[PDB]
Structures are given as structure tokens and as C-alpha cells.
Design a protein around this ligand. Structure first.
Ligand SMILES: CC(C)(Br)C(=O)Nc1ccc(C[C@H](N)C(=O)O)cc1
Ligand SMILES: CC(C)(Br)C(=O)Nc1ccc(C[C@H](N)C(=O)O)cc1
Lengths: 310, 310
């Protein structure tokens, strides 16, 4: 692959491709993503950090916002506690191999100039639009707070303030990103990563829904989680195990199985793996076993770096 | 009257009376109101400044917020223009005889501490509540902006930040004030003045509805405005002319009229005036003539101070 196709790989959408082409030519180009600090860092975070790495390899300076005020506004607790978890997440992202500028949003979100532009943007952001942009982000609340509609403006403002050429996020960030593209003088290139399905297939992988594999889960726990995971034979869509094979595993992939079940199977691409699964040539139990053992090897250096701290 | 009854006079409500009693005892007590800067200063503004004067006479230090960022958030234009009109309004309020601390909201509304508490309060203010509190304040907008729900939080925050014991406003400010009483550690005493009816009786006196008498209107213009004004015989409620007699005129009041219409009439109180009007003992034309001529004499020193600037 070339640089553009390496950035595009395993993304849901790039907004837009020609604009990304314009960016790649620059000697200096920056790319940002922000994370509300999370008690566990899971495969959904890893997918996005993997993509920030792809950009760093393509010559981007990477900015990681530890979004403490966003988490505060989205009801994750008190600021000092959120910042502690932010610092923990930083260590995890470094353990994943991302050397970047890790910044707390509150480092600039209280500047007078920034705050004035929050108010400028509030004047151009309709309440309906702001709520639409938060539908997949806002913490469930039967009595939604004003903080919910401040949140999207502040993300747009930070895209403006930190001056990134590229914003990266999960597909759930797309409407906030389409606000930023509409409201800001410089249109940011937006790279949207897929939203992983949760292990039970009930919804999306979520830190608060307990349907995730954490990057520092133990081998036994990964095996237990994958064993129980939704994985209907032949079904690829909404299949979290097929998702993990697509987004995290390396190919060629040797799938070990007994000779009585057709013997070990070497598949050279996820597309062949999908073909072998769509028609029950590969059983869920054998897919799960290989997905488990290979995911373990992938996360091992991460877990190990984190374990060494003890 | 004593101090409490002088403050209460011609108010719609005091929240609450016992709390105001506690305040009056203090050697130092402050009272605030804020005005979005307005191209014309009208009898509605004067009624509130008259009440700030009542408080100043009762030993309050008065704070007048020229609410430039509020007007900005409520779509009155650009900040520099709004501030010009703010400075004009200050001159008008001084011409009314109020010597006070006149402060632009933007002087403190961009402080880091203030802005952080905006976000704290956004977490405790529901979007429904915030919109309810703005129903009589927000500029008409088919596509309401996020600025609309930031506005009420910022007013509450300023009540907190500027530390007033008493907040004064028209009845349309009551729901914002009931937020401040619920959210802030120190419960502010709220003094609500009536909302004057517009001259056509169609609604409330408004700077943007052209149904007002401005304090610097010329005598001929006051007469023309009062002549055309809604004033049905016997009807006192919603009658702007009866309102002006109640809130602005001094009693005893001599009402001049021809001998053929019963001759000049001296009424010692608005209550007697209301009695003489409820049963058509006093005609609208005669009420209007006296209300016009006496309102002119009341506003004359104000108009004159303002004219001297030319
Ligand atoms: C400033 C830059 C460009 Br790094 C940026 O994109 N900031 C940002 C991004 C995402 C989030 C949280 C996010 N909405 C979520 O749901 O987790 C917060 C802040
Ligand atoms: C800070 C203090 C205590 Br002086 C205060 O009350 N500020 C305040 C009051 C009213 C308004 C505007 C008002 N909502 C309107 O509709 O005109 C803006 C700011």
C-alpha cells in the first residue's frame, strides 16, 4: 500500500479523500483525536490509536486530547479524578506504541479567547443540531443538561484552536465533525473509524456497557470473553469475532484445528477468512480459538509494558 | 412608608419578604440588575431604575450590568456595537438620577474561574429548565441556538460572581432567578417589577415592538403616543395609561378638564384614580391629557440632561 491507502485501510469514511490528498503533500501536518478518560482502555480505543499510528507513520504530528472537561461535561465525575484516569490512559496509549503530544483539554479550554469563541459558535449552532450530534455520545440522562449541548461546540472549538489538519474519531463523532466543517474557517479532514460491536452483539463496544475486551485483559479473560461472544456461523455482519480478525489480526493467519475438523488452515487475507466463514467452511469454535490466541499475542506487549509498572 | 414598604411599593413580588428583612439590617448590602443594551431606553427601563433608586435610598450599593455578552448571546449584534449602546444606556441611567457602579458583563465573564463555573452550572441545569427560563427573553428564532440556553446560566453565574444580596428584574426574569435560588450556595433576594403593557395593549412594552414611550421622547411625541394608546373606558387591567399613572405619576394629582366635563379633579391616590376610572367618572380623553402632561414633566429633567450633551 501507499500512504493514502495505508491511512484509509479499515476506516469507515474519509471526509474527504481529495482533501486528505492535499494534506499529505505538506511537510508539516497534524492529526488529532480526543478521548474522554476511561477506566478501561479497550479494543475500540486501540483501533483509533492504531489509526493515529498510521498517520504518524505518514508524517503527521499527533495530538491526543485527554478530554477532561468533555468527560466532566458528559458526567464522568469530578475533574481531578478524571485527570487521574486521563494520566492512566496516556500510559496505556504509550504502551500501545504511540509517541505523541498528550494534552488535557482544560489546558486551553479556559483561555479567554477560546471561551469567547465558544459563545460565537453557540450563536451559530442550533440546539437541535447540537443534540443530534450528541445522540451517540451523551451519557444517558432522562433530564438532559445544558452541558450536553455545550460539549459539541467545545469539540469544534478545539479543532479550531489546536489547528489540526485532520480529526480522527469513531463514526459516532461524524455529526460533531460535520459541524466543525460547517462552522470553522479551515475545513478539517475527518477520518472515521468503525464502531466495534460489543461481545454479546447487543450493541457497540462500550466502556460503560461491559461488552469489551480491554487491552490489558489477561489471557484467560480474553479466552473467556471470546468463548461467550456472539458468533453465529456464516454471519459476518455484527459479528465481533470477525471484526477482531479484520481490524486487529495479521495475515497470513494460520488457524489451528484438529485433523478431524479439517486440519490447520492458513488464510492469506481477512477477505478469504470472511469467505471461509460465510459458508460454514470455518467453524465459530475454531475461529474463536484462533482469534483468541492471536489477539492475546497482539496485546501481550501492551499488557507486559503495563505489568512492568508493578 | 418605612424602608421595606418603600422597596415593596409597585413591585409584583419579593422573593422573599423575610429574606429581604434579613438583608435590610446589614450595614453593607448590594443590589443588582442587568440590561441588554437597548437602542431606546423606555418606561420599562425607567421603572426598574426607579426601583434601584429605592434600594439605593435604603442603603444598597447598586450594580448595573451593561449586559454586553448577554445581548451578544441573545443576537443583538456585534460586541463592539453593543458596548457603544451600553455606554449610551449608562448615560441615560445616570440622567435618571442613579449614581451606581455600571459594569460590562464581559469585564468578568471571560475569567477562568467564572467560565469553569459556567460549566459546573451547565451540569446542573436541564435543557428544558433553561429553555423555560428564556421563554420571555430569547429573541424570536425559528432555529433556537445553543446561545439561548447558555444565557440563563451566565446570568445565574454573575449573580454568584458579583455577590449581590438582591437581584432586581422584570417578572420575565423570575425563572432565571428561581434557578439562581436553586443552584447557588447563597440564596439571592429577588425583586420583580411589573411588566408594562405596550401602548396598543397588544402585549408588553418592548424595545423591538415599537409600543413604548422612550424617556427622551419629545413632548409632542409623548402626546401623540398616548393619544393613540389603548385606553378603554372603565377598563383598568391591561390599560397602559392607567399603568403609567400608577407607576410614574405623583399624587395628589390634579386632572385638568373643562367645566362642561365636570371641571378639574384632584385625586389623592392612584386607588382613587382607579375608582374614578372603573366607573366612567373620569373619561379616557381627560385621563390621557393629564397622564401625557404629567409624564412629560416627569421625563423633562431626563430629556434635558440628555439634550445638554448636544
Ligand atoms: C482537539 C482535538 C482535535 Br485532539 C479533538 O479532536 N478533541 C476532542 C476529540 C474527541 C473528544 C471526545 C469524544 N467526543 C468522545 O466521545 O470520546 C473530546 C475532544
Ligand atoms: C450580575 C447581576 C446581579 Br447585576 C445581574 O443580575 N446580571 C444580569 C441581569 C439581567 C440581564 C439581562 C436580562 N436577562 C434581560 O432580559 O434584559 C443580564 C445580566
Amino acid at each position: 500500500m501507499d500512504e493514502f491507502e495505508m491511512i484509509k485501510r479499515n476506516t469507515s469514511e474519509i471526509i474527504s479523500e481529495e482533501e486528505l490528498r492535499e494534506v499529505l503533500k505538506k511537510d508539516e501536518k497534524s492529526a488529532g483525536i480526543g478521548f474522554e478518560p476511561s477506566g478501561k482502555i479497550h479494543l475500540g480505543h486501540y483501533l483509533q490509536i492504531k489509526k493515529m499510528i498510521d498517520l504518524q507513520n505518514a508524517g503527521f504530528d499527533i495530538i491526543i486530547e485527554l478530554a477532561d472537561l468533555h468527560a466532566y461535561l458528559n458526567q464522568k465525575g469530578e475533574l481531578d479524578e478524571i485527570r487521574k484516569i486521563g494520566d492512566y490512559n496516556k500510559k496505556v496509549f504509550e504502551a500501545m506504541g504511540l509517541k505523541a503530544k498528550y494534552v488535557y483539554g482544560s489546558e486551553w479550554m479556559l483561555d479567554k479567547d477560546y471561551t469567547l469563541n465558544v459563545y460565537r459558535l453557540a450563536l451559530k449552532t442550533t440546539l437541535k443540531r447540537a443534540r443530534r450530534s450528541m445522540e451517540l455520545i451523551a451519557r444517558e440522562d432522562e433530564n438532559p443538561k445544558v452541558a450536553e449541548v455545550i460539549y459539541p461546540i467545545m469539540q469544534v472549538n478545539s479543532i479550531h484552536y489546536k489547528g489540526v489538519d485532520v480529526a480522527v474519531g469513531g463514526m459516532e463523532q461524524r455529526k460533531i465533525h460535520m459541524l466543525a466543517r460547517e462552522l470553522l474557517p479551515k475545513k478539517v479532514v475527518c477520518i472515521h473509524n468503525p464502531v466495534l460491536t460489543g461481545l454479546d452483539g447487543e450493541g457497540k463496544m462500550s466502556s460503560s456497557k461491559g461488552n469489551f475486551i480491554a487491552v490489558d485483559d489477561s489471557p484467560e479473560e480474553i479466552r473467556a470473553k471470546i468463548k461467550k461472544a456472539y458468533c453465529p456461523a456464516g454471519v459476518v455482519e455484527g459479528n465481533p469475532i470477525m471484526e477482531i480478525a479484520k481490524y486487529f489480526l495479521e495475515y497470513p493467519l494460520t488457524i489451528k484445528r484438529p485433523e478431524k475438523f479439517g486440519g490447520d488452515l492458513t488464510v492469506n487475507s481477512y477477505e478469504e477468512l470472511e469467505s471461509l466463514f460465510k459458508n460454514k467452511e470455518l467453524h465459530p469454535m475454531d475461529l474463536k480459538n484462533a482469534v483468541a490466541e492471536e489477539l492475546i499475542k497482539i496485546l501481550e506487549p501492551i499488557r507486559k509494558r503495563l505489568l512492568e509498572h508493578h
